[PDB]
């Protein structure tokens, strides 16, 4: 009678996972209309970043042999024309490698057996030339998308299992999944942007969090738990760089639990060993990417390890505030000494973009790159409308009630000042999840687009409202508890259906005719070895289709590209035209492709348009005739007489412009 429970839990978890996958797939097909799109048109649907990553999957699946393709993409000389780079450890293209390795032999076998996996026919767009669209599991785009969606459809199962664990009742899991479904649009954007990296690294992060909660709750240990943690930590680091920081939150939330006598010694040792092993495997797999070191995930691991390995030496301390304060001081000291003792100590790379989107929000630090980051509206403060939509589904108030209940219970049932080393506190996983929720919320509020972490944790913590121990224990009988939890679920369904209705009703647009003509022109009227340079979103697609070498791309994290962008974007500045021509010639670029909408005054949000960003960043040159006026004049007049070194080659319907540098 207690075994049929586990079967139902597992079955419901799998069913909710499958339903989530179906939902994401349906939303994707509704938004983009991949069903009846030209094959060369889906790639154009893959915008600024999506195009870059998918280009390497397309390159690998096309090469004579998988080994030859991997060797090509590990020595890429076209992503950043001028020098050879290794794209596997720079862009984290392991998902593409795995997908191509699976696809190539699958398609070879399908051809061998004559199995009909790709069946397609012509699509008559209309006035434009008819195009051919192919659909099925064999079509490369469907294979990639199905892989992405299968990998990302287990987030529902992970959330359901987390709700079942921290609430020890199927009602907790139901509350978690229901809260996730109604707040789906604000939880993930995998149905609108598959090819990104987060779509691959979030499911594994959530799985690892669930596994860690399970380990903490039952106080497991041994080689089994270490292997289980590594199997989900390695993939989440090989798929996306930001995982290195996400894991840094866990060590910040695990530590707080460890210092509160809520985690045994053996389980803490197992967790830390699994983290160390996963980091070592990840570092060895990425050709020793230097940026892995000097991050906040390595020093944190070492500090937590030393704290764990010296805790028994302090078993005699009985004053909790002193213990906690000393542990926090040692943790912070080690973390900052390691991070500061290597980055500035040895000058080993290090990326300041994370630290520059924060000083620019508090101080007056303007800069140029931070200006690009802060004006995107997905690196800015989370807007009020998102909170309005979340509190509409009551996802927030339930989280607040559950958190207040848990804090009340912890205060009542714990002696805060004085500590006993031998006895464990009990309910460690709940505190761990609560601390991660606060960390994630503090992240999300500063920067939008990190609601990806804040919303699933809200769904999880909303399940504490169904715990028997947290909510009076046996003081409320059993008939009442079921009735109280059915009423809550009935209330939610009253405020959740409209959200699903709106999400399904939404329809996307797929016209984008200008870029198709521009790419036709590029394919027809230029050589195969020309070098292109221009605005970062256009160059990504220029590389993805037409296979022309590019000078700057949309991947902006690493150094060596920030200075390339600072030079390429000089065309919109007020510098003398001769100097910009010299810069372009030195870089070796042949064509500069941009849009006439980039050089239009805003007068509504200054310091977010290119004309303005080059005023502060280029103040000594202030007062000179801005180039944008020169480009507009040359485009409209059609005779580029005043701009001698340059010469407009392509100008169609005054939307896209291609200049040729002699």
């Amino acid at each position: 009678y207690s075994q049929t429970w586990l079967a139902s839990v597992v079955i419901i978890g799998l069913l909710v996972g499958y339903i989530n996958y179906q939902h994401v797939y349906t939303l994707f097909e509704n938004d983009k209309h991949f069903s009846h799109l030209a094959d060369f048109e889906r790639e154009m649907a893959y915008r600024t970043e999506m195009g870059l990553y998918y280009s390497y999957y397309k390159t690998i699946i096309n090469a004579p042999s998988f080994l030859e393709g991997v060797q090509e993409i590990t020595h890429d000389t076209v992503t950043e024309h001028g020098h050879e780079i290794n794209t596997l450890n720079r862009f984290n293209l392991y998902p593409e490698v795995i997908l191509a390795f699976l696809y190539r032999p699958f398609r070879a076998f399908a051809k061998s057996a004559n199995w009909q996996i790709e069946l397609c026919w012509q699509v008559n767009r209309g006035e434009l030339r008819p195009v051919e669209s192919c659909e099925g599991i064999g079509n490369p785009h469907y294979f990639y998308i199905t892989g992405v969606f299968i990998v990302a459809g287990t987030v529902a199962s992970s959330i359901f299992y987390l709700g079942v664990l921290v609430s020890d009742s199927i009602f907790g899991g139901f509350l978690s999944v229901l809260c996730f479904a109604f707040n789906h649009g604000e939880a993930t954007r995998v149905q609108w942007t598959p090819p990104l990296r987060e779509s691959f690294a979030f499911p594994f992060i959530i799985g690892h969090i669930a596994i860690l909660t399970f380990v903490i709750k039952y106080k497991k240990s041994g080689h089994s738990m270490i292997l289980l943690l590594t199997s989900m930590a390695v993939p989440a680091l090989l798929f996306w760089q930001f995982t290195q920081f996400a894991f840094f939150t866990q060590i910040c939330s695990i530590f707080l639990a460890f210092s509160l006598d809520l985690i045994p010694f053996s389980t803490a040792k197992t967790v830390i060993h699994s983290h160390i092993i996963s980091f070592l495997i990840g570092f060895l797999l990425l050709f020793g990417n230097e940026m892995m070191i000097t991050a906040l995930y390595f020093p944190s691991i070492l500090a937590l390890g030393m704290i764990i390995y010296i805790s028994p030496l302090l078993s005699n301390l009985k004053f909790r505030p002193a213990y906690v304060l000393f542990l926090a001081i040692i943790f912070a000291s080690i973390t900052l000494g390691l991070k500061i003792g290597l980055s500035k100590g040895l000058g080993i790379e290090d990326d300041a973009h994370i630290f520059d989107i924060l000083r620019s929000k508090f101080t007056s630090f303007a800069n140029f790159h931070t200006r690009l980051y802060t004006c995107s509206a997905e690196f800015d403060f989370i807007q009020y409308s998102t909170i309005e939509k979340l509190c509409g589904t009551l996802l927030i108030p339930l989280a607040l009630i559950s958190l207040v209940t848990f804090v009340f219970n912890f205060v009542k049932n714990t002696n805060l000042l004085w500590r006993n080393s031998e006895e464990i506190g009990e309910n460690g996983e709940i505190l761990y999840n609560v601390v991660q929720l606060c960390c994630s919320t503090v992240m999300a509020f500063l920067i939008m687009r990190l609601k990806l972490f804040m919303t699933p944790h809200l769904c999880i913590v909303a399940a504490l409202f169904a715990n028997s121990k947290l909510l009076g224990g046996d003081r409320i009988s059993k008939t009442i508890r079921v009735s109280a939890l059915v009423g809550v679920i009935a209330i939610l369904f009253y405020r959740g259906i409209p959200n699903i209705r709106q999400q399904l009703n939404v329809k996307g647009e797929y016209s984008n005719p200008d870029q198709e003509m521009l790419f036709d022109w590029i394919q027809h009227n230029t050589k195969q070895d020309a070098v292109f340079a221009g605005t970062m979103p256009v160059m990504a697609n220029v590389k993805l289709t037409t296979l022309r070498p590019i000078v700057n791309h949309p991947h902006y994290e690493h150094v060596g590209i920030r200075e390339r962008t600072l030079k390429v974007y000089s065309m919109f500045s007020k510098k003398p035209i001769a100097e910009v021509h010299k810069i372009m010639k030195e870089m070796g670029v042949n064509y500069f492709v941009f849009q006439l909408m980039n050089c239009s005054n805003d007068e509504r949000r200054p310091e977010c348009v290119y004309r303005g960003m080059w005023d502060e960043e280029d103040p000594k040159n202030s007062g000179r005739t801005a180039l944008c006026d020169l480009w507009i004049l040359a485009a409209n007049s059609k005779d580029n007489s005043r701009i001698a070194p340059f010469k407009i080659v392509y100008n169609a319907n005054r939307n896209y412009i291609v200049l040729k540098i002699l």
């Binding site: 600024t48 954007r189 609108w192 990104l196 690009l372 997905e378 979103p537 949309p554």
Partner: peptide, 7 residues
């Protein structure tokens, strides 16, 4: 708008 959007 240089990077993908949340829609």
């Amino acid at each position: 708008g240089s990077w993908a959007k949340w829609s």
